[PDB]
Design a protein around this ligand. Structure first.
Ligand SMILES: [Mg+2]
Ligand SMILES: [Mg+2]
Length: 325
DNA sequence: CCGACAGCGCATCAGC
DNA sequence: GCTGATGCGCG
DNA sequence: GTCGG
C-alpha cells in the first residue's frame, strides 16, 4: 500500500459512479486505475507518472495531482457532504440493495439503518437477510476461520456422497490472510456438459449443511448456484462467531478448470483476462474457452488444466496468489 | 473521433 | 404459466 | 474514464 491514499480515492470515486451515477463503465474505469496503481511498485510522485500506467488517463492524472498536493479531492469532499449521495451509498452496503433500490428507498424517506429496521416489510427476502446480518457481513474472515470452515464443508460434502469434490476458491485459494466470504466450487461425476444423471445435486449438499447448522440462511438458490449465510460452531461459554456469506457453485465436472479459474478471481483479474481473450480472438466464461469466428463463438476448446486456458490466449501462467488484482 | 468495455445465475416484474 | 427485461449478485 | 484503431 505504497499508494494507499490514491487507491482509496479512486475506489471511492468508483463506488460513487456505480451507486449514485449508475455509470458502470466509469465504475470499471476507476477500479482498473485503482488496481493498476495498487500493484505499481513505487510511491507515485505525480499524476504524469501515474498516467504512464494503462487505465490512468488525463482526468485521473489531474485528480492524482490534486490529491498529492492537498491530501484530498474536492469532488469527493462535495460528494461526502451531499445527503442524497451519502444515503444512497450507505444503503447499497446492504446485500440485496443496489443503486436502483437504494435511490427508491431514499425517495420514500428510508435512508438510515434505523429506517430499514422499521420498514422490514418493504424489503424482499435477500434484502431482509442482508439487513439482519449487516454488521457481520462487514467483517473479514481470518484465514484460520476459513480453514475451519473448509474442514466442515469438505467433510459434510463427503458424508453426502464421497464422489463430490468441493474446492474453496476466491481470495482463499489466492492465499489471502483474510477473506470477505467463502466460495465453494462443487463437482459431481453425475453432472457433466453431456448430461445430468441425477437431480438435486446442489440441494442435497445445501440440505446437509443446514442439517448440521452450518448454513443458517438462504439469499438465493437454484439448480447450480447457492447464495447464503453460514456460521462456525462455538464452544461452551464462548461468544458466537459472526455470520458469514457463503456462495456455492455446482459446475459440470468436465468443465472444472474453467470453473475454478472463474471462481478464483480476482474479479478485476477475470475482467482483464476475458478482455485479453477477446483481443486474442477467444471468449472465456466459467464453462469454456471458445474461438471467435463473424464474431460468433465456435465450439469449446479442449482444456486439461488452468494453464491450458492461459496458453490459448498467450499469457504466461499465473498462480492463484498472483491473480489478486 | 468513437465503439467497446466479461460473462453469467437467480429473483422480480411486466406483458401476454 | 411463459418470455424478456432489469436488478443484484458472483469471480 | 480510458483506450485502440
Ligand atoms: Mg470471496
Ligand atoms: Mg463470494
Amino acid at each position: 500500500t505504497l499508494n494507499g491514499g490514491i487507491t482509496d480515492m479512486l475506489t471511492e470515486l468508483a463506488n460513487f459512479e456505480k451507486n449514485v451515477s449508475q455509470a458502470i463503465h466509469k465504475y470499471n474505469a476507476y477500479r482498473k486505475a485503482a488496481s493498476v496503481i495498487a500493484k505499481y511498485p513505487h510511491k507515485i510522485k505525480s499524476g504524469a507518472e501515474a498516467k504512464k500506467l494503462p487505465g490512468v488517463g488525463t482526468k485521473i492524472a489531474e485528480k492524482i495531482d490534486e490529491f498529492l498536493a492537498t491530501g484530498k479531492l474536492r469532488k469527493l469532499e462535495k460528494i461526502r457532504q451531499d445527503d442524497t449521495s451519502s444515503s444512497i451509498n450507505f444503503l447499497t452496503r446492504v446485500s440485496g440493495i443496489g443503486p436502483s433500490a437504494a435511490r427508491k428507498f431514499v425517495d420514500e424517506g428510508i435512508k438510515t439503518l434505523e429506517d430499514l429496521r422499521k420498514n422490514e416489510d418493504k424489503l424482499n427476502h435477500h434484502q431482509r437477510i442482508g439487513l439482519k446480518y449487516f454488521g457481520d457481513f462487514e467483517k473479514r474472515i481470518p484465514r484460520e476461520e476459513m480453514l475451519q470452515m473448509q474442514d466442515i464443508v469438505l467433510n459434510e460434502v463427503k458424508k453426502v456422497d464421497s464422489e463430490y469434490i468441493a474446492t474453496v476458491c476466491g481470495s482463499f485459494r489466492r492465499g489471502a490472510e483474510s477473506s470477505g466470504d467463502m466460495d465453494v466450487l462443487l463437482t459431481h461425476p453425475s453432472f457433466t456438459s453431456e448430461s445430468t444423471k441425477q437431480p438435486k445435486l446442489l440441494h442435497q449438499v445445501v440440505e446437509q449443511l443446514q442439517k448440521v447448522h452450518f448454513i443458517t440462511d438462504t439469499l438465493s438458490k437454484g439448480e447450480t448456484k447457492f447464495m447464503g449465510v453460514c456460521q462456525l460452531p462455538s464452544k461452551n461459554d464462548e461468544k458466537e462467531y459472526p455470520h458469514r456469506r457463503i456462495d456455492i457453485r455446482l459446475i459440470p465436472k468436465d468443465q472444472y478448470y474453467c470453473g475454478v479459474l472463474y471462481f478464483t478471481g480476482s474479479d478485476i483479474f477475470n475482467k482483464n483476462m476475458r478482455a485479453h481473450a477477446l483481443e486474442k480472438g477467444f471468449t472465456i466464461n466459467e464453462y469454456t474457452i471458445r474461438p471467435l469466428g463473424t464474431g460468433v463463438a465456435g465450439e469449446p476448446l479442449p482444456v486439461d488444466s488452468e494453464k491450458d486456458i492461459f496458453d490459448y490466449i498467450q499469457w504466461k501462467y499465473r498462480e492463484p496468489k498472483d491473480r489478486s488484482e
